[PDB]
């Protein structure tokens with residue numbers, strides 16, 4: 317198995333973990349695209365040029381869209397950055413993002429070489 321395949325299986329494992337019951341208490345705001353209209357965030361799409369969420373990452377992984385781990389990481393980090401850009405840093409969703417990003421970053425660091 318090639319290194320890109322092996323690294324994308326590590327990425328797929330991380331993605332499975334981020335969507336797992338273990339992290340659900342803080343991962344759930346990142347499961348589906350932000351429904352700005354439903355949440356009354358009528359400025360969301362003016363501020364966030366590139367929306368990203370774990371369902372979109374899962375679809376891109378299933379569709380073999382990601383060519384390497386770096387591409388996968390960039391979407392997961394884009395999702396967190398969107399949260400930090402839109403939200404005051406003392407808001408509950410930001411605490412949830414920080415916790416889920418901690419799970420992501422520590423396991424992404426264990427990438428097989």
Ligand SMILES: CCNC(=O)c1ccc(O[C@@H](C)c2ccccc2)c(-c2cn(C)nn2)c1
Pocket residue numbers: 345346350355357398399402403404407408409412
């Ligand atoms: C700048 C002020 N921010 C918001 O008004 C706001 C409100 C709700 C959000 O999402 C719902 C799913 C939520 C609810 C409770 C706890 C946590 C989240 C969000 C939101 C969701 N995401 C991914 N980013 N912001 C922002």
